[model samples]
Target: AEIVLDRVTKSYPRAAVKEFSMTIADGEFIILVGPSGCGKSTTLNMIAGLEEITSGELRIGGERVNEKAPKDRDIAMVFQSYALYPHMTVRQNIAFPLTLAKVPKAEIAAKVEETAKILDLSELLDRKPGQLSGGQRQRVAMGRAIVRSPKAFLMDQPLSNLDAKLRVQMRAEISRLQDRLGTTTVYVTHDQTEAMTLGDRVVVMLAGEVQQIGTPDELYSSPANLFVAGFIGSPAMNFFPATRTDVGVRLPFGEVTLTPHMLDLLDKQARPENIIVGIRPEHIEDSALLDGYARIRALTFSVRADIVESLGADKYVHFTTEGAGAESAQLAELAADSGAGTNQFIARVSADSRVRTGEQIELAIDTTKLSIFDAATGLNLTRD
Candidate 1:
């Protein structure tokens, strides 16, 4: 069933979720991702009928469901905790909901068997929850959810408890199950990786407001603002203060040579004279790796490496600038907002390079992929 949130609003005395809206297509997997107090979980609770709507309209299959009871909503929620009954057998755990509904014994038996088959838990049907592993317990929780065949599944960080290896395993299993069942799903998690990997489209929320909503690639390559750019990427993006120059923006390190697109962006004289420049860590390369036109388009600089971390597959070099780095409160706020240390520069470079700790090395940045945001407004100007 399709779910719609038309100007939905949630409120309290101290804080509130502003006017927010989205249409969830049937069978679509949508993820709500943000930091704490961002209201992603609150939004899920509203949809599940666990929280009251302060003022708005919520529809399921085109029928107003704001006042309906949770049971009447016909939606299932899987929580972070396994929430399995310790004494109940796997079969009983999955059949509990159906039994409460007074479903016939034969139908309940068939459903329990089918759900176990889908979750690869058929062999564990007679086993107690205490005897199963964490991953197994989570599967039983899902089986309980699946048995009811709800119109929608509202999952809140269901895989957060498992070990790293087990989390990856269950992530794939959840994807497969959602695909086969084709149920509309609303998932809430603070993990950006899970949001990127699982959702058909991701909704970014911050401070009780919807920041942006798009595919993972859209969120990565074309973030709507400095906040989105700083929030979505791993290792976080490095932000610098730049003042508008004749042909480009001048950084404390050097001038960022502009392209025709950037020049046009600067042509509009109404924006702030100062802007924030953003570049992802992966866009930086060891100077030795570039050649020809590609090398020409890159900005190279020499800096001392304060720390070099090797992760087998890659290396990260952290450095700091000696000059007055980006003299703006917005830049500092962005640095703290992304959990990165102020005055620290982190670059993801190939380990094969000669760069090392305490050694001065040259780094090259691809100037084309650099993002420019209005200093005061935080809106991306490079986005077309």
Candidate 2:
């Protein structure tokens, strides 16, 4: 069923979620991602009817469910903790919800079997929660939720309990299950990786406000603002202070000629004199790897590597350039929240590169992919 949160707001003494609105299509997998205190879980709870909406309307299948109880909402929630019953067998646990609804024993048995088959837990149906591994226990929790075939699934960090390797395995499993079942799902997690991998559309939240809602690629390529740019990617995006030039923009390291498209965007913004420039680590490459027009157009610079991490397929080179790091309230708050130390630029160069720590190496950046942000507002000026 399609679900809608229209200008939903939640408050307890102070606002927790402010005017959260989205029209979730049936079978769409939507992820709410942000740091703690960002109210992602609060929004999920409101949808599940676990928390009351301070204002606005919630509709499920076109019926307003603002006053509906959790059970009446027909949404199944899988929490961070497995919340499985240690004493009950997997079959019993999966059947518990149906039993409470006075479902016939025969029908409950079929549903349990079907859910177990889908979760690859058919062989473990007789096992207790204590006897199963963490991943298995999580699967049982999922089974319990899926057996009833609820209108929607609310997963709050369901894979967080597993080890790193197991989490990746379960992540794929969850995605497959959601695809096969075609159930509308609302997932909440602080992990951006999970948000990127699982959601058809990711809603980024911060300080109880919606930051940006778009596909993972959109968030990665053209983040709505500095905060979204800094938060969405691994190793985060590198920020630099830029001075507007006559032709384009001048970074601390080098100059870039803006495209007419970019110039038009800047012109539309009233042409700020100072802006924050952002580039993803992947956009930087060993200068030796470029040739011809590509090499000529790239903004090349020389810097000594502070640290070189060899990860087989790729090399992460940490270094610094001229001038101070880009400073702003949003970046400062983000840095503090992430516990990051002194700013250092990172380049994800190819493994074939021979760059070493403490050695100066020339690197090239694909200037066309650069993102420009307003200094005062942190909004991405070049965003489409």
Candidate 3:
């Protein structure tokens, strides 16, 4: 189904989605990701015909479905809880949708068996959901959705109940299943990892408004605004105060040189002195660990790390800076979403670093790779 939301807006007493519009191509796997109550699920529900559209038009397969019932919209929803019946066997549960629609018994049986094989539930068909592992139960839920052969799939955080390891495994499983089915899939989740790995294109939302829609790489490399720059990454981007200079922004640690391309970008906007600078954790590294040209044309400075979280592959160095921390309504919202308060931030560097807690160390900041945003407007100065 080629689904399109044309100037879609939702409201009851307050507006949730604001003039949102996007086209989801046939057989495309698109993901809606954001923090809690960001209207991702609301948009998905509207698409599934589970929620009423207060304004704008919804088209599925070249037909308007704004007033159509969910069942008549030709899409199936797989929700967060897996919504299985305890008394029903897996076979019966998988066939419930078909049975409810009064499908012929023989045809329903054949389709259920085929879906069971596809989701690796053929062996567990007779087992109740309670008798199966969490992963197995999730597969049964998927089998229930797929047996109907709907034009599109609407999945809402379907793996949230599983263990961390199982979530990882099911991420791959769901990706493979989507590939084989070639069905248009719209998935909603607050997990950025799932959004990055699963979606061909991702829609980032905030406060019921569409923030940005692009490939994951586009979002990671060039965020549309401060909100997206902070929300899309795992460790989240480190944002701090920068004083606008003739060349670039001046940090308390050191001066960062700006590329000509970036300088021109800033020139397009009024030279805002109070600017917000963003640096991805992975972009900063230990100065002693870098070599050759990697160390050249970079701002190398010293700071005492207060905490060093040693994960197996790398260490997250936490430190404070003399530069004034950024303050805004958006920053506060982002801080809450990231679970990291202001001033203190983590930098991802190689495990070979010799930095330790309460120890002073030199870190290299890649001035060439900074994201400069207008503080007043919260607009990325270097965005295309």
Candidate 4:
């Protein structure tokens, strides 16, 4: 069934989610993703009727459910911490939601068994939460939500506690299960990879506001704003302040001329100056391809390459960039806060590139795919 949030808002004495609104179609998997304190989880809670909306309406399956409690809303939720009853066996925990509705004992038992089998929890049904592994507990939590066969499902970062490998496995499993059941679902997470992989539509939020909502392909190909561009991609998009001039766009390293077609795509708010150039790491390549595109020379600089992560199929080069004096200090500060180094950039290069750590290498960018944004508004100039 479809789920809709109409002008929803939630506020605590200290924090608030303002003017949240979105419609989730039946059987659609929608993901709410953002940094912490962006009100993703709060929005999910408001929809599930777990938290009171400060104002506005909520509807499920064409019914206005603003006054309904969580149980009455006929929706199920799986929390990040699993929230399984520690003292109860997995079977009992899975059956609790159905039993609360006063379902017949025979029917409840049948439903619980079916759900356990689907979730691959049949063997672990008799174990308590404390006795099961992290993944097993997570399956039990999902089983609980599935037993009721609710119209909609709400999930709050359910894989956050698992190890990296297990998280990947569970993410795929959840996506497959959702497809099999065709349940309208709203999932909340801070993980961009999970959001991109599992969601039919992704809602990006910041500071209690909706930044952008689009399919994974749309978001990746054309981000609405600088925040969406940087937040949605792995290693993030590279940003360099530039100015639009009669000759071309001017950057720190050099300038690249824009075609008439490219200039026409710029938004009305975009100015000739105060433009920000954005490029994804995957869009940037080795200097060997620099013959046609614009090129930047790194000069003679030093970088401390701390981590070299190999994904077998691809390689990530993580290093800190250094300049001189205040410029160097500013770069350091930016990299420090960026989770890598102050002036770090991640290049998703081919496994055959043979680039090694602590080695300074010249990089080239694919200028055709480069993005431009307005510095003051943070809106992508190329977005329509």
Best by lDDT: 2
Q: Which stretches of candidate 3 lie over 4 Å from their true place?
A: 125-131
For model 2, name the residue pairs that clash. Answer: none
Better of 1 and 3 by TM-score: 3
Score residue 116 of candidate 2 by CA lDDT: 83
- Pick by TM-score: 1 or 2, better one: 2
Local accuracy of candidate 4 as per-residue lDDT tens digits, 96-208: 88887788899887777778889887666556444577888888788888878888899878988999988889999999999999889899988689999888999987767
lDDT of each: 0.81, 0.83, 0.82, 0.73
Off by over 4 Å in 2: 125-131
Model 4 off-target regions past 4 Å?
125-130, 267-272, 289-313, 318-342, 358-360
Per-residue lDDT over 1-384 for candidate 3, one digit per residue giving the tens place of the 0 to 100 score:
888878788997878888898899998888999888888888988998878999889888677889989879889988899888888888878889999998789888788777888877767744744447777888888888888889889998898899997888899999998998899999998878889988899988888877668898898888887888888788888887777777767875677667767687687767537577888898888875567887676577878998999876798999887646687667777877565657787888788888778998877876778888776657776773
Candidate 1, residue 131: the lDDT equals 45
- TM-score of each prediction: 0.94, 0.95, 0.95, 0.87
lDDT of prediction 4: 0.73
lDDT, residue 30, model 4: 90
lDDT of 2 by residue, 17-121 (tens): 987889899988999998877788989888887788889999998889999899888889888887877677777788889999997888777877777888878
Error of 3 at 68 (Å): 1.0
lDDT of 1 by residue, 194-308 (tens): 8888889899877677867978898898887777787777788788766677677677677766886668865665664767688799988887758788877777888999999
Q: List RMSD in Å for every model shown.
A: 2.0, 1.7, 1.7, 4.0
